[PDB]
Amino acid sequence: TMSPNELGLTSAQDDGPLGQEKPNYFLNFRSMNVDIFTVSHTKVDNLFGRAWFFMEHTFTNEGQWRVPLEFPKQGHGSLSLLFAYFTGELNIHVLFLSERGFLRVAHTYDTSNDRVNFLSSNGVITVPAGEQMTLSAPYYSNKPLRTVRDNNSLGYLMCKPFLTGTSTGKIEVYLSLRCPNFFFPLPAPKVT
Amino acid sequence: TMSPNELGLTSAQDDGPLGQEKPNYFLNFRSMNVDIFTVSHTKVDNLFGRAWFFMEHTFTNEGQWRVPLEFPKQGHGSLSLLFAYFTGELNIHVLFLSERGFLRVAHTYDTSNDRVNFLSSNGVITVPAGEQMTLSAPYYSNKPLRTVRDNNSLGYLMCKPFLTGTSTGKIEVYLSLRCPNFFFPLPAPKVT
Amino acid sequence: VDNFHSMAYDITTGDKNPSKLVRLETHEWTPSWARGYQITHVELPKVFWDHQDKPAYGQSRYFAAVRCGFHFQVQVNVNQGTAGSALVVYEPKPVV
Amino acid sequence: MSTKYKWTRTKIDIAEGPGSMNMANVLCTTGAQSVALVGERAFYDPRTAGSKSRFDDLVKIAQLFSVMADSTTPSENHGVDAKGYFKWSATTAPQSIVHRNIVYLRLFPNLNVFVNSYSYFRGSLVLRLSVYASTFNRGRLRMGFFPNATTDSTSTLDNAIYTICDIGSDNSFEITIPYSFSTWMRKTNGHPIGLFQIEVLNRLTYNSSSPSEVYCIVQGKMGQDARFFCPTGSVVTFQ
Amino acid sequence: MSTKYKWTRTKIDIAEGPGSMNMANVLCTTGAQSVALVGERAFYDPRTAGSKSRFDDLVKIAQLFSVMADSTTPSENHGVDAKGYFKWSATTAPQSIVHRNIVYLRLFPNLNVFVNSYSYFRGSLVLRLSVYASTFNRGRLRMGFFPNATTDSTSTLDNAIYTICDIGSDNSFEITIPYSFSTWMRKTNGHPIGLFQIEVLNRLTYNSSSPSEVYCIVQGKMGQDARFFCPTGSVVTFQ
RNA sequence: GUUUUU
RNA sequence: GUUUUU
RNA sequence: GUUUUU
RNA sequence: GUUUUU
């Protein structure tokens, strides 16, 4: 039968270990699970499998653009802030807004600035002007885990455009991840 | 044999329940079914599976465009007005008429305006300038059924364009639905 | 349970009482009225709690949500000499 | 081993109009991409609608009766108009007309919708005349129909598809028109369905306490063999 | 042999919006190209995180208690505010209120995150009141909850979902609210969850060496049947 | 690592 | 030449 | 006409 | 839900 513990009478100091799926009942109540869709939208793989805006850059010349990639404190991706460590594939969505040219894109977790001077070794997929690509950067991280908060939690992204004439433009960036491994959930964030 | 009831002699007050496929005959007449095509054009899935114009928007800048989506009182889609409730997939056809840029598109049934500020979480498929896409929005409705008439019977559509230069244009919209679930047919509409 | 049944009623009488059949409305059709004129109407479902004298009025007070089915019986009596016809129809919120 | 040929990605030719969007074929739209989080489907709830299943075919709606050219007031021209709401009188003589008009699908609320949706159709049409008299009133009324007729003029119905109505307990009378046209399918909004006439056969009798004239209603619906075919543009705008 | 037809590369029609990038469906993103040297996968190391496996479902986090409208100082308005940190007093009379406020998911740190992520949800909510008194203090306190209520006013809880708390060794009391809404799923950040009231049933008793008033904490979490559905935009920015 | 999907 | 991949 | 390839 | 199609 039902114990008084499952009826509401408990002790907060007896909750450890963390993660106790204890059932709560009353005479007219029972945990009822109802699913409205064929799958879950709470699973890390599904939720995060959907991109979210990151930032935009306007380029008037080929100069290279390197930006630290970090988890959002803004979109649905904020749900990541509930975790401390991450590891796994990283989907980067880049849009090249230009009239005539090409955009070199590359990703590295390496903090050294110089390693990115010769962009070709790193990757540098090519998005023709007016096209958008989605490259999935692997976990080539020199650190087993990525503190999820760091201003560079995610590796740096490189964008250099091979323009042809006076043409200029702007590069919008969106980020998403493939199968994410989060660990050791930390306390919920505050609001600004 | 044939009863006088099936020969025309009946009583209007004995029609309930609704939906009586009673056969009507005469000496030289019998219900003859002849099909001219390999399939039906009366089935809800087929008829509505074909789009119809909705509305057009001209944009001179990136400002976002949100428009309530509703059933037509104009095209063949008007046949929906014969029903009261709807539920199912929604096919949205968008044409981006622009010289150089990108068009963010997203759909939500959520009435709150703010939820749409950060468009990325919602969806935001990308149609490059001069391209047209057909996105099928699922029934992410907080209401089990959508009164078919409401000025927002269908969820709201969001369009924000990431233009690059002074370029401007117009976005034409067409709507269609995938497998529609209509219920409780109501009286026929009037004319203007 | 009173084994003598000093109250000869089904034990679940009080429970089912609120589902009991009740008079929701009455109106006098006026002969002059044109076709398509609305004779009378009843707010559904709040009409079953129309007055504090409605069997369902009691419980209806202690709950904010409701999910129910109806069984209407519109009655109209007229001598044989007279004739006419009325349209009794249910109109969901969408129609209304 | 196939190492005499360098390995390569498959090469394919792209047909004309790549990127063209087909908004005519359902087989095309249903295959469109999904903005769903996981390109998933939801569980529909018919119960909230009081139904056990969704509505799959529209033809069934076209098979639902609707008053013809319904009006607030009865025909003020002895029924010679399109109003399917006319009066039958003690005054009208036998062979006198109580109603006459050319019938079109658009004259019916339900059907008029399909008329503004589909371009063609086929099948039989059923009209049901409901005379509302008292239990004392008696008489007969013959309603005929000349399929495909256009001359709106009273004419003997001896050769037309008619139905004689003898007042009793079931005072609703039906008349079926089987599909009649040169073409296999016919314009939804084209040539008339035919001439509809309801002539008096036997004067409506009455007594001291019964009405000398009664009201009549004409409804119309599609037969069990009804079909609609091509969807076309709209000729009117609903509200 | 098929030598009556010249050999040809396959021809295919390209659907609308080729090159369009779908950033909504996961099934789309996971299939994106790989910039990996050999489009390879790495071996993850959970141990360094002290875990034996990664975290797969987020709902479990929504099922973790968090203080409601937590503050540094206890409710200075006799608990009539949103602060889930109030004081119970020897002074307060029975039926007097120690706390009252309208509850929203955003009032909880953990939940507020999901509120800013998902658009809808469903399931029961659990609130746990923890009164920290000494082993000598005794008394009762009834906390009720009117689901979906909006009028923030003290009212008899005899008809509300309540839980009577008798001080003892386990001074943490729970109360479950089963999902209650017209809709199957409900706005994450919409209509209130209901009216939460904690009234005094029996004055907190004490003695010469025990406190005349104690501190209380109210936590909130989702039930085992909790679910979230559509991810929506953000209504606030975290730090 | 069914950690694309069954 | 498993020297595309297993 | 293994005359795309084996 | 054969609720893409058979």
From Swiss-Prot, chains D, E:
It is found in: Virion; Host cytoplasm. The N-terminus binds RNA. Forms an icosahedral capsid of pseudo T=3 symmetry together with capsid proteins VP0 and VP1. The capsid is 300 Angstroms in diameter, composed of 60 copies of each capsid protein and enclosing the viral positive strand RNA genome. Capsid proteins interact with host alpha-V/beta-3 integrin heterodimer to provide virion attachment target cell. This attachment induces virion internalization predominantly through clathrin-mediated endocytosis. Binds packaging signals present in the viral RNA. Interacts with capsid protein VP0 and capsid protein VP1 to form heterotrimeric protomers. Five protomers subsequently associate to form pentamers which serve as building blocks for the capsid. This is Capsid protein VP3. It comes from Human parechovirus 1 (strain Harris).
